[PDB]
mmCIF file of all heavy atoms in Angstrom:
data_model
loop_
_atom_site.group_PDB
_atom_site.id
_atom_site.type_symbol
_atom_site.label_atom_id
_atom_site.label_comp_id
_atom_site.label_asym_id
_atom_site.label_seq_id
_atom_site.Cartn_x
_atom_site.Cartn_y
_atom_site.Cartn_z
ATOM 1 N N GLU A 48 238.753 141.691 56.569
ATOM 2 C CA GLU A 48 239.384 141.571 55.306
ATOM 3 C C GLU A 48 240.863 141.604 55.467
ATOM 4 O O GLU A 48 241.571 141.021 54.604
ATOM 5 C CB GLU A 48 238.951 142.883 54.499
ATOM 6 C CG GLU A 48 237.421 142.768 54.190
ATOM 7 C CD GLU A 48 236.945 143.990 53.506
ATOM 8 O OE1 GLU A 48 237.704 144.881 53.211
ATOM 9 O OE2 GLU A 48 235.694 144.104 53.157
ATOM 10 N N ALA A 49 241.363 142.180 56.532
ATOM 11 C CA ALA A 49 242.816 142.282 56.693
ATOM 12 C C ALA A 49 243.567 141.262 57.417
ATOM 13 O O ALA A 49 244.657 140.745 57.112
ATOM 14 C CB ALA A 49 243.274 143.640 57.414
ATOM 15 N N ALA A 50 242.883 140.638 58.321
ATOM 16 C CA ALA A 50 243.484 139.747 59.337
ATOM 17 C C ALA A 50 242.817 138.234 59.440
ATOM 18 O O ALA A 50 243.318 137.497 60.065
ATOM 19 C CB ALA A 50 243.462 140.316 60.827
ATOM 20 N N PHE A 51 241.684 138.130 58.652
ATOM 21 C CA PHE A 51 241.083 136.860 58.551
ATOM 22 C C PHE A 51 241.001 136.393 57.054
ATOM 23 O O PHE A 51 239.887 136.342 56.495
ATOM 24 C CB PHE A 51 239.654 136.845 59.243
ATOM 25 C CG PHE A 51 239.617 137.001 60.733
ATOM 26 C CD1 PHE A 51 240.070 138.085 61.360
ATOM 27 C CD2 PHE A 51 239.318 135.886 61.590
ATOM 28 C CE1 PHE A 51 240.071 138.230 62.810
ATOM 29 C CE2 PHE A 51 239.118 135.976 62.895
ATOM 30 C CZ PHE A 51 239.585 137.197 63.576
ATOM 31 N N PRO A 52 242.151 136.061 56.415
ATOM 32 C CA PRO A 52 242.044 135.674 55.101
ATOM 33 C C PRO A 52 241.264 134.456 54.804
ATOM 34 O O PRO A 52 241.287 133.468 55.612
ATOM 35 C CB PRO A 52 243.549 135.447 54.732
ATOM 36 C CG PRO A 52 244.229 135.222 55.979
ATOM 37 C CD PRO A 52 243.482 136.113 56.950
ATOM 38 N N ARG A 53 240.537 134.475 53.787
ATOM 39 C CA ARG A 53 239.600 133.485 53.388
ATOM 40 C C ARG A 53 240.298 132.141 53.010
ATOM 41 O O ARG A 53 241.395 132.240 52.480
ATOM 42 C CB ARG A 53 238.660 133.906 52.131
ATOM 43 C CG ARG A 53 237.683 133.041 51.763
ATOM 44 C CD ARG A 53 236.766 133.685 50.791
ATOM 45 N NE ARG A 53 235.462 133.188 50.628
ATOM 46 C CZ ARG A 53 234.543 133.535 49.890
ATOM 47 N NH1 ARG A 53 234.636 134.522 49.044
ATOM 48 N NH2 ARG A 53 233.326 133.007 49.824
ATOM 49 N N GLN A 54 239.660 131.050 53.369
ATOM 50 C CA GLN A 54 240.298 129.609 53.088
ATOM 51 C C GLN A 54 239.108 128.927 52.385
ATOM 52 O O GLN A 54 237.839 129.198 52.464
ATOM 53 C CB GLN A 54 240.621 128.943 54.294
ATOM 54 C CG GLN A 54 241.889 129.631 54.966
ATOM 55 C CD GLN A 54 242.650 128.609 55.919
ATOM 56 O OE1 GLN A 54 242.619 127.382 55.584
ATOM 57 N NE2 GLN A 54 243.228 129.159 56.825
ATOM 58 N N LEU A 55 239.523 127.990 51.498
ATOM 59 C CA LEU A 55 238.530 127.216 50.807
ATOM 60 C C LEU A 55 239.106 125.736 50.757
ATOM 61 O O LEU A 55 240.131 125.470 50.353
ATOM 62 C CB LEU A 55 238.325 127.677 49.440
ATOM 63 C CG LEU A 55 237.142 126.940 48.654
ATOM 64 C CD1 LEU A 55 235.825 127.203 49.256
ATOM 65 C CD2 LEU A 55 237.250 127.358 47.153
ATOM 66 N N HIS A 56 238.273 124.792 51.190
ATOM 67 C CA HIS A 56 238.519 123.307 51.192
ATOM 68 C C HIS A 56 238.543 122.810 49.786
ATOM 69 O O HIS A 56 237.871 123.259 48.950
ATOM 70 C CB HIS A 56 237.311 122.668 51.789
ATOM 71 C CG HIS A 56 237.674 121.144 52.157
ATOM 72 N ND1 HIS A 56 237.780 120.149 51.353
ATOM 73 C CD2 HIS A 56 237.731 120.685 53.574
ATOM 74 C CE1 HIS A 56 238.000 119.172 52.042
ATOM 75 N NE2 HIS A 56 238.006 119.302 53.299
ATOM 76 N N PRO A 57 239.743 122.042 49.428
ATOM 77 C CA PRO A 57 239.965 121.491 48.118
ATOM 78 C C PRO A 57 238.714 120.637 47.552
ATOM 79 O O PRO A 57 238.599 120.604 46.255
ATOM 80 C CB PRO A 57 241.162 120.705 48.167
ATOM 81 C CG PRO A 57 241.202 120.205 49.671
ATOM 82 C CD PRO A 57 240.624 121.427 50.334
ATOM 83 N N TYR A 58 237.891 120.232 48.358
ATOM 84 C CA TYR A 58 236.699 119.323 47.910
ATOM 85 C C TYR A 58 235.580 120.254 47.401
ATOM 86 O O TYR A 58 234.604 119.742 46.879
ATOM 87 C CB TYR A 58 236.194 118.390 49.002
ATOM 88 C CG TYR A 58 235.131 117.484 48.706
ATOM 89 C CD1 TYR A 58 235.310 116.437 47.778
ATOM 90 C CD2 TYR A 58 233.889 117.695 49.286
ATOM 91 C CE1 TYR A 58 234.174 115.532 47.609
ATOM 92 C CE2 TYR A 58 232.989 116.747 49.017
ATOM 93 C CZ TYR A 58 233.000 115.706 48.123
ATOM 94 O OH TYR A 58 231.939 114.828 47.958
ATOM 95 N N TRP A 59 235.601 121.650 47.428
ATOM 96 C CA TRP A 59 234.431 122.380 47.309
ATOM 97 C C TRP A 59 233.848 122.270 45.813
ATOM 98 O O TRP A 59 232.588 122.232 45.718
ATOM 99 C CB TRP A 59 234.667 123.846 47.521
ATOM 100 C CG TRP A 59 233.551 124.661 47.167
ATOM 101 C CD1 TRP A 59 232.341 124.893 47.786
ATOM 102 C CD2 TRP A 59 233.395 125.365 45.872
ATOM 103 N NE1 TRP A 59 231.523 125.576 47.049
ATOM 104 C CE2 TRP A 59 232.094 125.951 45.873
ATOM 105 C CE3 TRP A 59 234.142 125.529 44.704
ATOM 106 C CZ2 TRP A 59 231.589 126.635 44.899
ATOM 107 C CZ3 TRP A 59 233.702 126.278 43.722
ATOM 108 C CH2 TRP A 59 232.364 126.888 43.791
ATOM 109 N N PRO A 60 234.621 122.138 44.724
ATOM 110 C CA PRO A 60 233.903 121.809 43.464
ATOM 111 C C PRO A 60 232.974 120.611 43.361
ATOM 112 O O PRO A 60 231.878 120.677 42.827
ATOM 113 C CB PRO A 60 235.102 121.719 42.385
ATOM 114 C CG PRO A 60 236.193 122.521 43.032
ATOM 115 C CD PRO A 60 236.039 122.327 44.614
ATOM 116 N N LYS A 61 233.504 119.540 43.950
ATOM 117 C CA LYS A 61 232.660 118.353 44.050
ATOM 118 C C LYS A 61 231.420 118.541 45.079
ATOM 119 O O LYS A 61 230.280 117.991 44.809
ATOM 120 C CB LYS A 61 233.378 117.188 44.392
ATOM 121 N N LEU A 62 231.781 119.221 46.243
ATOM 122 C CA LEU A 62 230.867 119.399 47.238
ATOM 123 C C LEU A 62 229.615 120.187 46.620
ATOM 124 O O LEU A 62 228.544 119.919 46.895
ATOM 125 C CB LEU A 62 231.527 120.210 48.302
ATOM 126 C CG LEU A 62 230.674 120.462 49.683
ATOM 127 C CD1 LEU A 62 230.515 119.039 50.351
ATOM 128 C CD2 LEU A 62 231.382 121.456 50.431
ATOM 129 N N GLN A 63 229.976 121.242 45.809
ATOM 130 C CA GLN A 63 228.959 122.102 45.347
ATOM 131 C C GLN A 63 227.885 121.324 44.485
ATOM 132 O O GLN A 63 226.616 121.428 44.756
ATOM 133 C CB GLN A 63 229.502 123.168 44.365
ATOM 134 C CG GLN A 63 228.504 124.122 43.687
ATOM 135 C CD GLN A 63 229.008 125.030 42.653
ATOM 136 O OE1 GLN A 63 229.700 124.512 41.731
ATOM 137 N NE2 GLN A 63 228.822 126.301 42.737
ATOM 138 N N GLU A 64 228.433 120.374 43.643
ATOM 139 C CA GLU A 64 227.440 119.684 42.882
ATOM 140 C C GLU A 64 226.804 118.612 43.567
ATOM 141 O O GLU A 64 225.552 118.262 43.357
ATOM 142 C CB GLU A 64 228.065 119.037 41.623
ATOM 143 C CG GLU A 64 227.213 118.283 40.746
ATOM 144 C CD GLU A 64 227.904 117.814 39.518
ATOM 145 O OE1 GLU A 64 228.754 118.476 38.893
ATOM 146 O OE2 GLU A 64 227.502 116.666 38.965
ATOM 147 N N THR A 65 227.521 117.861 44.485
ATOM 148 C CA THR A 65 226.859 116.749 45.226
ATOM 149 C C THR A 65 225.815 117.135 46.121
ATOM 150 O O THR A 65 224.882 116.522 46.283
ATOM 151 C CB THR A 65 228.018 116.016 45.956
ATOM 152 O OG1 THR A 65 229.021 115.527 45.117
ATOM 153 C CG2 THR A 65 227.424 114.834 46.749
ATOM 154 N N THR A 66 225.902 118.305 46.762
ATOM 155 C CA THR A 66 224.824 118.825 47.504
ATOM 156 C C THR A 66 223.679 119.396 46.735
ATOM 157 O O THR A 66 222.516 119.164 47.211
ATOM 158 C CB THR A 66 225.393 119.990 48.647
ATOM 159 O OG1 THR A 66 226.268 119.327 49.441
ATOM 160 C CG2 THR A 66 224.234 120.593 49.196
ATOM 161 N N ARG A 67 223.926 119.831 45.646
ATOM 162 C CA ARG A 67 222.835 120.316 44.724
ATOM 163 C C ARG A 67 222.072 119.136 44.282
ATOM 164 O O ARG A 67 220.891 119.238 44.287
ATOM 165 C CB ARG A 67 223.318 121.060 43.554
ATOM 166 C CG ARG A 67 222.350 121.497 42.558
ATOM 167 C CD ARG A 67 222.956 122.366 41.436
ATOM 168 N NE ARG A 67 223.470 121.622 40.307
ATOM 169 C CZ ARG A 67 224.756 121.540 40.061
ATOM 170 N NH1 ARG A 67 225.671 122.288 40.619
ATOM 171 N NH2 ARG A 67 225.111 120.721 38.940
ATOM 172 N N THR A 68 222.789 117.985 43.913
ATOM 173 C CA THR A 68 222.089 116.801 43.421
ATOM 174 C C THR A 68 221.430 116.067 44.555
ATOM 175 O O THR A 68 220.286 115.489 44.332
ATOM 176 C CB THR A 68 223.098 115.812 42.764
ATOM 177 O OG1 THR A 68 223.717 116.358 41.640
ATOM 178 C CG2 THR A 68 222.530 114.457 42.528
ATOM 179 N N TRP A 69 221.911 116.192 45.841
ATOM 180 C CA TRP A 69 221.199 115.673 47.018
ATOM 181 C C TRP A 69 219.906 116.474 47.232
ATOM 182 O O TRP A 69 218.836 115.868 47.407
ATOM 183 C CB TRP A 69 222.194 115.824 48.148
ATOM 184 C CG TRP A 69 221.652 115.255 49.487
ATOM 185 C CD1 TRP A 69 221.637 113.835 49.778
ATOM 186 C CD2 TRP A 69 221.164 115.851 50.600
ATOM 187 N NE1 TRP A 69 221.075 113.780 51.049
ATOM 188 C CE2 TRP A 69 220.783 114.875 51.529
ATOM 189 C CE3 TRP A 69 220.887 117.248 50.903
ATOM 190 C CZ2 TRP A 69 220.299 115.233 52.836
ATOM 191 C CZ3 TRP A 69 220.441 117.608 51.991
ATOM 192 C CH2 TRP A 69 220.075 116.629 53.055
ATOM 193 N N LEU A 70 219.909 117.761 47.075
ATOM 194 C CA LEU A 70 218.663 118.613 47.332
ATOM 195 C C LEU A 70 217.649 118.137 46.240
ATOM 196 O O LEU A 70 216.512 117.996 46.526
ATOM 197 C CB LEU A 70 219.002 120.081 47.155
ATOM 198 C CG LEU A 70 219.877 120.728 48.203
ATOM 199 C CD1 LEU A 70 220.120 122.133 47.817
ATOM 200 C CD2 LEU A 70 219.061 120.652 49.544
ATOM 201 N N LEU A 71 218.029 117.878 45.039
ATOM 202 C CA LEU A 71 217.315 117.335 43.941
ATOM 203 C C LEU A 71 216.595 115.998 44.250
ATOM 204 O O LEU A 71 215.431 115.807 44.226
ATOM 205 C CB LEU A 71 218.127 117.319 42.712
ATOM 206 C CG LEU A 71 218.027 118.436 41.728
ATOM 207 C CD1 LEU A 71 219.001 118.467 40.565
ATOM 208 C CD2 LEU A 71 216.629 118.698 41.116
ATOM 209 N N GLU A 72 217.498 115.174 44.675
ATOM 210 C CA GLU A 72 217.019 113.671 44.791
ATOM 211 C C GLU A 72 216.283 113.455 46.020
ATOM 212 O O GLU A 72 215.281 112.590 46.024
ATOM 213 C CB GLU A 72 218.299 112.773 44.674
ATOM 214 C CG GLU A 72 218.949 112.706 43.372
ATOM 215 C CD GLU A 72 220.156 111.867 43.438
ATOM 216 O OE1 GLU A 72 220.530 111.361 44.413
ATOM 217 O OE2 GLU A 72 220.878 111.674 42.265
ATOM 218 N N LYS A 73 216.473 114.111 47.110
ATOM 219 C CA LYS A 73 215.704 114.026 48.328
ATOM 220 C C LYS A 73 214.464 115.009 48.201
ATOM 221 O O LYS A 73 213.714 115.054 49.079
ATOM 222 C CB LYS A 73 216.615 114.541 49.444
ATOM 223 C CG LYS A 73 217.690 113.544 49.816
ATOM 224 C CD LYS A 73 217.253 112.200 50.329
ATOM 225 C CE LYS A 73 218.376 111.144 50.491
ATOM 226 N NZ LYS A 73 217.891 109.918 51.023
ATOM 227 N N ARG A 74 214.357 115.662 47.027
ATOM 228 C CA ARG A 74 213.151 116.490 46.887
ATOM 229 C C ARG A 74 212.959 117.598 47.938
ATOM 230 O O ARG A 74 211.882 117.893 48.437
ATOM 231 C CB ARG A 74 211.895 115.624 46.672
ATOM 232 C CG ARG A 74 211.920 114.853 45.331
ATOM 233 C CD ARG A 74 210.693 113.888 45.224
ATOM 234 N NE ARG A 74 209.393 114.540 45.483
ATOM 235 C CZ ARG A 74 208.342 114.069 44.875
ATOM 236 N NH1 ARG A 74 208.310 113.151 43.950
ATOM 237 N NH2 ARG A 74 207.248 114.769 45.010
ATOM 238 N N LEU A 75 214.038 118.253 48.425
ATOM 239 C CA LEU A 75 213.973 119.218 49.364
ATOM 240 C C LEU A 75 213.622 120.531 48.929
ATOM 241 O O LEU A 75 213.059 121.400 49.592
ATOM 242 C CB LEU A 75 215.289 119.249 50.147
ATOM 243 C CG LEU A 75 215.622 117.994 51.056
ATOM 244 C CD1 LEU A 75 217.164 117.882 51.364
ATOM 245 C CD2 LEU A 75 214.759 118.106 52.271
ATOM 246 N N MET A 76 213.938 120.770 47.742
ATOM 247 C CA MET A 76 213.443 121.980 46.972
ATOM 248 C C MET A 76 212.935 121.668 45.694
ATOM 249 O O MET A 76 213.434 120.591 45.054
ATOM 250 C CB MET A 76 214.525 123.008 46.853
ATOM 251 C CG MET A 76 214.793 123.821 48.115
ATOM 252 S SD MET A 76 216.431 124.715 47.960
ATOM 253 C CE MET A 76 216.149 125.521 46.515
ATOM 254 N N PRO A 77 211.923 122.305 45.024
ATOM 255 C CA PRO A 77 211.477 122.057 43.712
ATOM 256 C C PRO A 77 212.585 121.970 42.747
ATOM 257 O O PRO A 77 213.578 122.786 42.882
ATOM 258 C CB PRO A 77 210.511 123.154 43.396
ATOM 259 C CG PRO A 77 210.036 123.492 44.799
ATOM 260 C CD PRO A 77 211.101 123.447 45.709
ATOM 261 N N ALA A 78 212.440 121.144 41.808
ATOM 262 C CA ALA A 78 213.614 120.789 40.913
ATOM 263 C C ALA A 78 214.053 122.066 40.133
ATOM 264 O O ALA A 78 215.312 122.305 39.895
ATOM 265 C CB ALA A 78 213.207 119.668 39.936
ATOM 266 N N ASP A 79 212.993 122.905 39.686
ATOM 267 C CA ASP A 79 213.509 124.198 38.932
ATOM 268 C C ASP A 79 214.099 125.198 39.819
ATOM 269 O O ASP A 79 214.967 125.925 39.346
ATOM 270 C CB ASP A 79 212.131 124.707 38.230
ATOM 271 C CG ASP A 79 210.961 124.563 39.010
ATOM 272 O OD1 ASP A 79 211.103 124.614 40.265
ATOM 273 O OD2 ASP A 79 209.844 124.656 38.406
#
């Protein structure tokens, strides 16, 4: 918490949805 401050890649908002849609379209997990 003190010496390893968190970082986040700027693509993350698009990454979040694109991987979710990929899981959907590849049928890797049930849609619901």
